[PDB]
Design an enzyme around this catalytic site. Structure first.
Site, short mmCIF file in Angstrom:
data_model
loop_
_atom_site.label_atom_id
_atom_site.label_comp_id
_atom_site.label_asym_id
_atom_site.label_seq_id
_atom_site.Cartn_x
_atom_site.Cartn_y
_atom_site.Cartn_z
N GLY A 35 0.14 -46.59 -17.76
CA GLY A 35 -0.77 -45.45 -17.88
C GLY A 35 -0.77 -44.90 -19.29
N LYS A 69 -1.26 -32.61 -21.55
CA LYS A 69 -1.88 -33.89 -21.99
C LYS A 69 -2.51 -34.57 -20.78
CE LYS A 69 -1.10 -38.45 -24.05
NZ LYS A 69 -0.12 -39.40 -24.64
N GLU A 74 -4.74 -52.70 -21.11
CA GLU A 74 -4.03 -52.62 -22.43
C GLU A 74 -2.52 -52.82 -22.28
OE1 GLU A 74 -6.88 -49.11 -24.52
OE2 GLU A 74 -4.73 -48.71 -24.22
N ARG A 112 7.36 -32.71 -19.94
CA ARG A 112 6.63 -33.41 -21.01
C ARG A 112 5.23 -32.79 -21.15
NH1 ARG A 112 10.07 -34.30 -23.80
NH2 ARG A 112 8.49 -35.41 -25.04
#
Ligand SMILES: O=P(O)(O)O[C@@H]1[C@@H](OP(=O)(O)O)[C@@H](OP(=O)(O)O)[C@@H](OP(=O)(O)OP(=O)(O)O)[C@H](OP(=O)(O)O)[C@H]1OP(=O)(O)O
Ligand SMILES: [Cl-]
Ligand SMILES: [Mg+2]
Ligand SMILES: [Mg+2]
Ligand SMILES: [Mg+2]
Length: 134
Positions: free
Chosen positions: A42, A10, A61, A81
């Site tokens: 992040g 990812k 954000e 991950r």
């Protein structure tokens, strides 16, 4: 839309959001899924989004700050991950009071001395703790 490198990691971008050019205090934010834990702000790069652009968008954000984007620190993998994160320096020049994640999920933010940031990241986010290794 989540994006991926050719090996299926990812694609992510993160900023070490410093209070000043001295880089002695960094902004961490609360995990969405576990609010008593601290993370480096992040998240996912969007399709064809430059990493520097993704890092600035994610910090606005998640952390409600803006400022001057500095150097790429490095590209960090999390094998567990399957994340590959571009990590930049940002010097914070604007702190907004009511940002996207404050309104949407009650995300918290807090200034940490670098050594305290590394300490609170180590248990759950040892790769994020490694962002500060230099
Ligand atoms: O809750 P966890 O432990 O499963 O980790 C979460 C992590 O949560 P956090 O670090 O907050 O505990 C999220 O970060 P976030 O929800 O706080 O944003 C992070 O997403 P991301 O930061 O890569 O994605 P986005 O910020 O939204 O773009 C990932 O969430 P997502 O994949 O549901 O977008 C990560 O999950 P994995 O990619 O499987 O590791
Ligand atoms: Cl500082
Ligand atoms: Mg995101
Ligand atoms: Mg995120
Ligand atoms: Mg996000």
């Amino acid at each position: 839309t989540r994006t991926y490198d050719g090996d299926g990691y990812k694609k992510r971008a993160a900023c070490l959001c410093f209070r000043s050019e001295s880089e002695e205090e960094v902004l961490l934010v609360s995990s969405s899924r576990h609010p008593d834990r601290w993370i480096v702000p992040g998240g996912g790069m969007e399709p064809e989004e430059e990493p520097s652009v993704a890092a600035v968008r994610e910090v606005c954000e998640e952390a409600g700050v803006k400022g001057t984007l500095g150097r790429l620190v490095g590209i960090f993998e999390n094998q567990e991950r399957k994340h590959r994160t571009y990590v930049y320096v940002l010097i914070v020049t604007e702190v907004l009071e009511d940002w996207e994640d404050s309104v949407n999920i009650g995300r918290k933010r807090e200034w940490f001395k670098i050594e305290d940031a590394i300490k609170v990241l180590q248990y759950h986010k040892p790769v994020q703790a490694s962002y500060f290794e230099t």
